[PDB]
Amino acid sequence: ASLSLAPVNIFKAGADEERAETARLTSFIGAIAIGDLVKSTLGPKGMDKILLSSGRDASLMVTNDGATILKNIGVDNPAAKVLVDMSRVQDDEVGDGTTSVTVLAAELLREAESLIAKKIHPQTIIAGWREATKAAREALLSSAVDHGSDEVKFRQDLMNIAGTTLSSKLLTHHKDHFTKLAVEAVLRLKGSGNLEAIHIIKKLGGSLADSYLDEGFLLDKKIGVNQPKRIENAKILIANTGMDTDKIKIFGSRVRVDSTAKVAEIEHAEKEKMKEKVERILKHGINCFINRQLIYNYPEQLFGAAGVMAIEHADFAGVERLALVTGGEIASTFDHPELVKLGSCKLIEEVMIGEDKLIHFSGVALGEACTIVLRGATQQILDEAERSLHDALCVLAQTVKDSRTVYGGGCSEMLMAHAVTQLANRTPGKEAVAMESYAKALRMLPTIIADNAGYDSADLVAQLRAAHSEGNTTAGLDMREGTIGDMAILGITESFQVKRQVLLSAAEAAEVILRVDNIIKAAPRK
């Protein structure tokens, strides 16, 4: 019999259970619904979504990013939860491919539903899909091209990759400007993978083309009262000290005297200790001083009288970025001035960006930290521009780590699907049908890309398939007019890591979901 369809009831009140038919039905419906929802935001002609929060804040946001769309939705279908977690992990591993992996998994699960309807055991489907994934991964790896040796060719590849990444986002209006922006920002990292070293500042007003990459660094903190507002040939000293009612860490200590004169003497001693601390700091021979923590009024006036610009409350990220951009060392003791190196820059001044005043570091020494200013018409536009820059910078950093590139515009999907079809044509049994369905989903990916543009998807996909079977391994969709063309000439390139991750994660999640033949739910708390 069955756990639920039995004369005796074996569950608590509210617990449920779905056998093979119901479990497969719910899993497939959830996966297909997620895939259909996240699709149509795919390809250069994809559209955005509005996410309206139902909470008290009622936060509003428009986005083209699949991961953010899947994150901010109330999901009850467990397979939909699997796909959402897949998209989030894909976003964590690489910046792009969040929509593509979800669409691929949904198409694979739809083909699995068709195969199950054709009376094929899911284990056979899983084995065929494993073989197809192996073949497709081998083909994609064999198709990869590396240009990490030549610097000009590598820069061209980076430009093409950034353009392809930004082509589907709202930044496609100024794709060229934003591609230059992202490429310069990533190249300024000097090989480090620290994306936190690139700070994005969103200031309302102005056009989206007014966004720029500052040649130095911008800090959103304030200067003291009497301290100078402009320093030339600055000698930066980055610190992480107290500078705020600095107390001895002996927390069991107390002042116990028999007269207020002694209390006044102890207070003067504390002030003298702070003055000696400031004098030790000044003995480094500095023009500027950035402290991570607060700076109280007495050290503030000491710095002002010394003619030293002191910036307070620059958080951990702030002091780290200043250390990266100026070369200074984050210090906490000042008894050895000769053992601490000082940051340097040509000029520090205050600049106006909209209606706010920011501190500008110009002519920096190292510059391995960037500040990107985003100007937009609305808050939603600023948020989407920030997300698009995050995607572009992540993909560019991944390409810097691994310089292997593959062609986009459906070329890689066509090549992998052609390899899978070749493998399936030489395999007997229903595993051949499973691999054919795998290749069908791989075809469906650029089919959806072309459908989003309103093109004749069937004809374009057939032409691409014919070209790839003939031997034209670089053919791909040309979204400019709606034909097929050489992706190498047209410069649609992608990170090999991104497509490999998309394919592998989609296959893995499809296999994981397909293995389920029963869904059992505990009684909810509500």
Partner: protein, 116 residues
């Protein structure tokens, strides 16, 4: 009185720090916040712990540098002023911890910091 009232959401708990210089607050979004009584600036906001925090406990032997926060995430996680990081976390609790008492600390399950 401080009566700062810089808060977008309600305050589950406003625990005055053992050091008579600053206050520790946690909003309804699950993020703790540290305020300086004298200056008034927010020193640092602690991310993570998505569900709203429900209890705040400072270190008992003065040492205004570490504290433990628990809320609806069924979590008992410990912070540090000097780094602004979750130095330690716990998983035993499973239901909306209401109040926490610092001994190790007992929350409602006695945790031990020396052995997790």
């Amino acid at each position: 009185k401080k009566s700062v009232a810089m808060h977008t959401n309600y305050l589950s708990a406003c625990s005055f720090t053992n050091s008579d210089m600053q206050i520790l607050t946690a909003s309804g979004d699950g993020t703790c916040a540290l305020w300086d009584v004298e200056s008034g600036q927010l020193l640092q906001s602690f991310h993570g712990h998505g569900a709203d925090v429900l209890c705040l406990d400072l270190a008992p032997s003065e040492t205004g540098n570490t504290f433990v926060s628990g809320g609806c995430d069924k979590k008992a996680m410990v912070w540090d002023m000097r780094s602004g990081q979750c130095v330690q976390a716990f998983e035993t609790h499973e239901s909306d911890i209401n109040s926490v008492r610092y001994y190790a600390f007992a929350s409602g399950r006695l945790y031990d910091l020396r052995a997790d």
